[PDB]
Design a protein around this ligand. Sequence first.
Ligand SMILES: Nc1nc2c(ncn2[C@@H]2O[C@H](COP(=O)(O)O)[C@@H](O)[C@H]2O)c(=O)[nH]1
Length: 124
Amino acid sequence: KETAAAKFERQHMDSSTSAASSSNYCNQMMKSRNLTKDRCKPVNTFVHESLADVQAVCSQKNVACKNGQTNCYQSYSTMSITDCRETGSSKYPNCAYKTTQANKHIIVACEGNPYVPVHFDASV
Ligand SMILES: Nc1nc2c(ncn2[C@@H]2O[C@H](COP(=O)(O)O)[C@@H](O)[C@H]2O)c(=O)[nH]1
């Protein structure tokens, strides 16, 4: 089945655009990446950098994840991201999102060999 590394790329990577270019960004990208198939996912961040630069995070600053695990890493640089989160109008299967574009450090958790990101923890 899909691996956790492919799942993080599908859920979180958008190196095709530099930033969200309209208020409809998250509605179109949450539907097209299949993240509203079973239920509206309520929050989801996309990162607008190359895949190499996000895989490099797993060699930068180790930090504790929100839930206490110690395989999270925080980016040294800020990155261009879009935060999508559900709005009061959202109702399955017509999931609805507000798009917020921002430049933040990312914190991801890494696993495997090669050791790559498999979960988006937070933006700070
Ligand atoms: N699992 C996951 N959490 C995220 C993502 N983007 C942001 N978050 C987290 O979701 C939080 C906001 O969710 P909440 O505060 O409503 O449960 C932020 O504090 C951050 O920790 C994402 O793509 N996946």
